[PDB]
Amino acid sequence: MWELTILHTNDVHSRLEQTSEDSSKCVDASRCMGGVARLFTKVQQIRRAEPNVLLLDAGDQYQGTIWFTVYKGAEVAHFMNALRYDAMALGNHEFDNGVEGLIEPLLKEAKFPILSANIKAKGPLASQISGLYLPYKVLPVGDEVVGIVGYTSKETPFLSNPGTNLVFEDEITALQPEVDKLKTLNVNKIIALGHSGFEMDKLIAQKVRGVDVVVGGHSNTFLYTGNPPSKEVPAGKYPFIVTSDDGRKVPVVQAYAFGKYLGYLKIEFDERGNVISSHGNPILLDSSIPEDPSIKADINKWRIKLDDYSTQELGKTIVYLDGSSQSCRFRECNMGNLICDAMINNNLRNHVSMCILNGGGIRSPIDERNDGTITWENLAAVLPFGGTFDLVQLKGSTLKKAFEHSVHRYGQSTGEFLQVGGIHVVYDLSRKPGDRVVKLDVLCTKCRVPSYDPLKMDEVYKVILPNFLANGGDGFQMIKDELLRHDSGDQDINVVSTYISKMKVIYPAVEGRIKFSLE
Amino acid sequence: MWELTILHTNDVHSRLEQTSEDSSKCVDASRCMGGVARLFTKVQQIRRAEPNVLLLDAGDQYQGTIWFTVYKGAEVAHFMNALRYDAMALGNHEFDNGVEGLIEPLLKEAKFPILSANIKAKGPLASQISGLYLPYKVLPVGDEVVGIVGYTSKETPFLSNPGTNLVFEDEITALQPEVDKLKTLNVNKIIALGHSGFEMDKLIAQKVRGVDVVVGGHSNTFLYTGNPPSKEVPAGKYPFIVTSDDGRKVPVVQAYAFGKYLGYLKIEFDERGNVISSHGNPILLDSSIPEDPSIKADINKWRIKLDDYSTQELGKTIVYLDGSSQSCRFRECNMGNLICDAMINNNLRNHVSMCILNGGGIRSPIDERNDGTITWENLAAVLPFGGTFDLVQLKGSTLKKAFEHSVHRYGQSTGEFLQVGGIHVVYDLSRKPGDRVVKLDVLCTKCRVPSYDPLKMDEVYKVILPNFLANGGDGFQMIKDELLRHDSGDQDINVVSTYISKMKVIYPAVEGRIKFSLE
Ligand SMILES: CN(Cc1ccccc1)c1nc(Cl)nc2c1ncn2[C@@H]1O[C@H](COP(=O)(O)CP(=O)(O)O)[C@@H](O)[C@H]1O
Ligand SMILES: CN(Cc1ccccc1)c1nc(Cl)nc2c1ncn2[C@@H]1O[C@H](COP(=O)(O)CP(=O)(O)O)[C@@H](O)[C@H]1O
Ligand SMILES: [Ca+2]
Ligand SMILES: [Ca+2]
Ligand SMILES: [Zn+2]
Ligand SMILES: [Zn+2]
Ligand SMILES: [Zn+2]
Ligand SMILES: [Zn+2]
């Protein structure tokens, strides 16, 4: 038997420092979690104990906090290099700052292979990106070799800005010939490492002949065997077992997000590279694990430059600003109401009364226990993308279809669920998709006293929304296709920041803007 | 036959200048109404035409605009004297600034008799107030005499600050011996002029033997025969006929409020002072009637001092601020929501989440068509009383009873109807009084994310409300009797003014805080 320990992270999203349990800024250091210093301690402890170890990342290191806004990936190359990651697969957020934002800060500076087998470069770009990422890497581990084959979401063109020169093939189509090539090179132990979501990961496990294990990301999937150590509810056992079409049991793993957990899988291989068994569980990187002092001091050095975004108080909150995915993708969330109220307040300076906002665009909560203080740093984790809040004119029919889209596949923690302003929507999830909106009232504009009236299909409404939605992001194709007017607006973070400074003390409530009917 | 023309006003409430149709500040002079200059023109036109005329006021000249805040009744004595009023009865708002606020500005300066037969002075006050008001006045009108007997609401001690030295008797008990005294003096034509409301007026007509006509006020009752000329819906025909217990047809009249109409009743008397017939209608004092130039110039002179309250823009509204009685005493009104939002914003600077406000305390709307400008003058007509917004701690049971009180006699345009903040109430008017509240949800305080939960009878809530309600005003005896804590707060007008200045542009909506169930 030959035992391999796979350590893995995914969707770290710029949480270089330790954080609160909800992955927002660490205030009470006594109960903080994650961060690269604490992760280092845990990894080193495992490397001391186990002779055959791989530390892998399944993408989306890019984007999430002021670390990325300021260092733009240089912090990722630096601290991943310091942690001695063995390999990384490209995620969609690695393309947020174009191909040049991936090439210069990360690809040219990483000391570990960066992988994607389903990304093919064309035109002038093909010439200089050659060699900076690889379809696979064969890694020596003890007296053996392990093949790692990469993959990135085929949907990346729609999720990010990878440009016109990169082609994203179907993951299964692209993976099979690379796995077959590795098998002809006598590599009998193969890990598929990539960034497409748990559903695609299970499909890769089922269909790509020769993959022994799948390490994934993108869906922030939490898997656990037994009693979970924190608030994340398991979506399945760890590892999640898939029976392949050629009859093999293939473990599929993922480790939630934000560096809160370290994924840990032990695989028992035979001499021909068959998986005899596997077991493990994600390790909660809580305060019981000490933060490595060398890494922590280097984090404290890089932290100096970021304190310009922490010293200015924009305002105060006396309520928890719930920007969690568990709230904002399933129900009305007070962070969504705050952001929509700021959006409407900004354009009103009777003009435009309605706001829609994809809940998945709210990327972090903000805690009120830090003497209620809100800084640019706190808001930057909520709104990291540098988008704008645009003015659009829609038909009632278009809006009805958008609200049907908001809940068409409700229950999967998808970002399309809409947060609102100037709208009172009631859904009935017992009804079929496309017919779940049972009430949709909107604030009148052509009235001297604003009040709620039923939306009319043949009428025209002005809505403030992110450019992400005006461009048909999150499958809101009907908005881009059917809109009547589209005016570009102010930068998202500046809109909210200005609103918080005007109000001084905020207390946004959940107040019945979105409801679900029991009957 | 001897014909008398009675001209009458009531509840003028400091509308010395002409106003908008809704009785708020005149902006578009082309369509403005009321005011003392326009009233003078109409009265003079009638005096030229009819030889036997009386111009009467049924109280509540005091309180309503910056005119009263600044001149404190000196403007009332002055312009009533200029209009040559023949008599006035004391209203409840004539006692708002104590007995000294009635005595010095008005009683010592009026050139016409001021009347009340059911007000008896005691102690040290009895000595100097003697003669300044009278129970009645016998007035020469041509070759005849007409007796006018006054009356003031027996409830004045609870509605105003008349002090401990004045006793308010039952109107009928006090009126009968004065009417009997007038009959022994061979006065066969008697007008009862007073300030108790249309219901008491009908009772006086029915029960006080010898009263030929009742001229009233206090309930802002609009009566009309035929098609009404503006937005006020008639409560009955003009005059309203009562058959007395001794078998006589007694006309009862009232002329709405704010000087928008001039009450006009022609009475045909026989030689023994029996009413043979009567007819008339309130005259809409609209732009077709020219404003008298002499009065208008004198109004413009007194106006100079008030322009200090008009030059400073506190902020802007882009919506009509509906502070009308027709909205605020019957349904959720956006002026109530604005005032409750300002009340909560002021104390929050999780602390206190709920607001209740008697709709009758909202004394005027504010128009948005004046380039949306809001001044101290505009807010002073909304909040003329100089009250405070106090913090109180109530049991859920107490709150439930207050909300039952808010709709116990719904439909009568009474001021107890509550406007709210941090409360979602649903009423069912088909149910019996005391059991009409079908839903009452309140914003949690002991929660990190505020949200609505059903009120609990045995729990404790902190509510911001006017001192008027904390003192059990508008029959909210349960608040004064059952409250657990009462802290005095900031001046009402300053709270709203400060909130408007912080927001800069306001757009309060009607948003479902108060609802009525159809079933
Ligand atoms: C501007 N920009 C990025 C971008 C778009 C185009 C061109 C360049 C850049 C975004 N803008 C906005 Cl508003 N919402 C977004 C965006 N990126 C994701 N999201 C949201 O995040 C949800 C997915 O979150 P997760 O479940 O954590 C997976 P992942 O971390 O891969 O995003 C989506 O369903 C969206 O709602
Ligand atoms: C402070 N103060 C006065 C006052 C109280 C006590 C001691 C000294 C002064 C008031 N405070 C407040 Cl908040 N609401 C009031 C008040 N005076 C009336 N109201 C309201 O106005 C309604 C009646 O209005 P109307 O139908 O037009 C008759 P009227 O014009 O006679 O008031 C009442 O039902 C109350 O809701
Ligand atoms: Ca194998
Ligand atoms: Ca008579
Ligand atoms: Zn991610
Ligand atoms: Zn992703
Ligand atoms: Zn009045
Ligand atoms: Zn009154």
The finding on whether B96 has its CB within 6 A of some atom of ligand 2 is: yes
Give, as residue ranges, everything with CB less than 5 Å from ion ligand 3. A 188, 212, 273
Sign of the CA dihedral running B378, B383, B389, B394? negative
Strands lying side by side in the sheet with B452-454: B452-454, B437-443, B423-427, B514-516
Strands lying side by side in the sheet with A354-358: A418-421, A354-358, A460-466, A388-395, A485-491
For residue A345, give the chain B residue with the closest CA: B505
B471 burial class (0-12, 13-18, 19+ CB within 10 angstroms)?
middle
What are the two backbone dihedrals, phi and then psi, of residue B3, each rounded to the nearest 5 degrees? Answer: -100, 130
Question: What is the phi-psi region of residue A475: left when phi exceeds 0, alpha when psi lies from -120 to 50, beta otherwise?
Answer: left
The finding on whether A282 has its CB within 6 A of some atom of ligand 1 is: no
Q: Do A504 and B509 touch (CB under 8 A)?
A: no
**Continuous segment of H or E residues that includes residue A493:** helix A492-503
Nearest to A511 among B349, B452, B509 (CB): B452
* Long-range contacts of the stretch A175-179 (C-beta < 8 A, 24+): A175/A117, A175/A118, A175/A149, A175/A151, A175/A204, A175/A208, A175/A211, A176/A207, A176/A208, A176/A209, A178/A117, A178/A135, A178/A136, A178/A149, A179/A147, A179/A149, A179/A208, A179/A209, A179/A210, A179/A211
The finding on whether B468 has its CB within 6 A of some atom of ligand 2 is: yes
Structure token pair of residue A354:
């309605």
Distance (angstroms) between ligand 2 centre and the Cα of B41 equals: 31
Tell me the C-alpha distance between A439 and A144, whole Å: 62
Nearest to B449 among A334, A349, A351 (CB): A334
Residue whose C-alpha is closest to residue A359's, from A415, A421, A423, A406 = A415
Mutate to test the pocket of ligand 1, among A90, A156, A164, A358 (most ligand atoms within 8 A of CB): A358
For residue A369, give the chain B residue with the closest CA: B448
Nearest to B449 among A319, A348, A449 (CB): A319
The finding on whether A358 has its CB within 6 A of some atom of ligand 1 is: yes
What are the two backbone dihedrals, phi and then psi, of residue B473, each rounded to the nearest 5 degrees? Answer: -70, 155
Sign of the CA dihedral running A488, A489, A494, A496? negative
- For residue A48, say whether it is annotated as part of any ligand binding site: no
A74 burial class (0-12, 13-18, 19+ CB within 10 angstroms)?
middle
A432 burial class (0-12, 13-18, 19+ CB within 10 angstroms)?
exposed
The helix-helix angle for B171-184 and B198-207 (nearest 10°) equals 40
The finding on whether A17 has its CB within 6 A of some atom of ligand 1 is: no
Residue whose C-alpha is closest to residue A436's, from A460, A417, A453 = A417
Structure token pair of residue B389:
């917004």
Structure token pair of residue B326:
């027709």
Structure token pair of residue A346:
């900004």
| Alpha carbon distances (Å) from A339 to A465, A494, A496 | 10, 11, 6
Q: Do A449 and B509 touch (CB under 8 A)?
A: yes
Tell me the C-alpha distance between B505 and B519, whole Å: 38
Tell me the C-alpha distance between A476 and A480, whole Å: 7
What type of residue sits at position A250?
V
**Continuous segment of H or E residues that includes residue B232:** none
| Alpha carbon distances (Å) from A490 to A375, A421, A466 | 19, 18, 10
A261-269 and A275-280 beta bridge pairing: antiparallel
Q: Do A503 and B505 touch (CB under 8 A)?
A: no
Domain ranges within chain B, ordered by starting residue: 1-312, 313-519
Tell me the C-alpha distance between B303 and B306, whole Å: 5
Q: Do B318 and A351 touch (CB under 8 A)?
A: yes
Query: Which residues have a C–N gap over 2.5 Å right after them in chain B?
Result: 349
The finding on whether A415 has its CB within 6 A of some atom of ligand 1 is: yes
- Smallest CA–CA distance, residue B448 to chain A, in Å, is 5
The residue whose CA has the least distance to atom 24 of ligand 2 is: B360
Sign of the CA dihedral running A377, A378, A384, A388? negative
Structure token pair of residue B6:
């009675």
Tell me the C-alpha distance between A267 and A379, whole Å: 42
What type of residue sits at position A76?
V
* The residue to which tokens 């249309």 are assigned: B198
CB pairs under 8 A between A and B: 74
- Smallest CA–CA distance, residue B502 to chain A, in Å, is 7
A511 three-class SS:
coil
Tell me the C-alpha distance between B421 and B432, whole Å: 26
| Residue A22 neighbours by CB under 8 Å, 6+ apart | A324, A364, A365, A367
Q: Do A451 and B510 touch (CB under 8 A)?
A: yes
The finding on whether A220 has its CB within 6 A of some atom of ligand 1 is: yes
What are the two backbone dihedrals, phi and then psi, of residue A352, each rounded to the nearest 5 degrees? Answer: -135, 130
Tell me the C-alpha distance between B400 and B405, whole Å: 9
Torsion of CA B7, B10, B16, B18, to 10 degrees: -80
| Alpha carbon distances (Å) from A168 to A153, A172, A192, A217, B501 | 8, 12, 17, 17, 54
The finding on whether B22 has its CB within 6 A of some atom of ligand 2 is: no
- Looking from the CA of residue A471, the nearest atom of ligand 1 is 6
Residues of A with CB below 8 A from B509's CB?
Answer: 443, 449-452
The finding on whether A390 has its CB within 6 A of some atom of ligand 1 is: no
Q: Which ligand is closest to the CA of B160, given by its number?
A: 2
Distance (angstroms) between ligand 4 centre and the Cα of B211 equals: 7
Nearest to B512 among A448, A452, A508 (CB): A452
For residue B509, give the chain A residue with the closest CA: A450
| Residue A465 neighbours by CB under 8 Å, 6+ apart | A343, A355, A356, A357, A389, A390, A392, A479
Nearest to B448 among A320, A503, A505 (CB): A320
For residue A318, give the chain B residue with the closest CA: B350
| Alpha carbon distances (Å) from B269 to A310, B146, B266, B384 | 86, 11, 10, 42
Q: Please tell me whether the peptide bond between A239 and the residue prior to it is cis, using omega within 30 degrees of 0.
A: yes
Contact B46, B290 (CB under 8 A): no
Tell me the C-alpha distance between B24 and B378, whole Å: 8
Distance (angstroms) between ligand 4 centre and the Cα of B235 equals: 26
What type of residue sits at position A420?
V
- For residue B347, say whether it is annotated as part of any ligand binding site: no
Residue whose C-alpha is closest to residue A339's, from A477, A495, A486 = A495
- For residue B11, say whether it is annotated as part of any ligand binding site: yes
Residues of B with CB below 8 A from A450's CB?
Answer: 319, 334, 507-510
Strands lying side by side in the sheet with B485-491: B418-421, B354-358, B460-466, B388-395, B485-491
* Optimal mutation site among A326, A348, A355, A448, interface B, most CBs of chain B within 10 A: A448
The residue whose CA has the least distance to atom 16 of ligand 1 is: A361
Resolution in A: 1.9
- For residue B363, say whether it is annotated as part of any ligand binding site: yes
The finding on whether B63 has its CB within 6 A of some atom of ligand 2 is: no
| Alpha carbon distances (Å) from B306 to B70, B302, B377 | 7, 8, 8
Q: Do A318 and B424 touch (CB under 8 A)?
A: no
* Optimal mutation site among B420, B424, B448, interface A, most CBs of chain A within 10 A: B448
- For residue B269, say whether it is annotated as part of any ligand binding site: no
Residue whose C-alpha is closest to residue B419's, from B508, B320, B318 = B508
Structure token pair of residue B221:
């009752």
- Smallest CA–CA distance, residue A506 to chain B, in Å, is 9
Q: Please tell me whether the peptide bond between B162 and the residue prior to it is cis, using omega within 30 degrees of 0.
A: no
The residue whose CA has the least distance to atom 7 of ligand 2 is: B160
Residue whose C-alpha is closest to residue A361's, from A466, A221, A214 = A466
Residue whose C-alpha is closest to residue B289's, from B54, B45, B82 = B45
The finding on whether B377 has its CB within 6 A of some atom of ligand 2 is: no
Residue whose C-alpha is closest to residue B152's, from B177, B170, B164 = B170
The helix-helix angle for A492-503 and A334-348 (nearest 10°) equals 90
- For residue A10, say whether it is annotated as part of any ligand binding site: no
Tell me the C-alpha distance between A65 and A63, whole Å: 6
Distance (angstroms) between ligand 7 centre and the Cα of B92 equals: 8
Q: Which ligand is closest to the CA of A388, given by its number?
A: 1
Tell me the C-alpha distance between A63 and B379, whole Å: 49
| Residue A241 neighbours by CB under 8 Å, 6+ apart | A249, A250, A251, A252
Q: Do B450 and A509 touch (CB under 8 A)?
A: yes
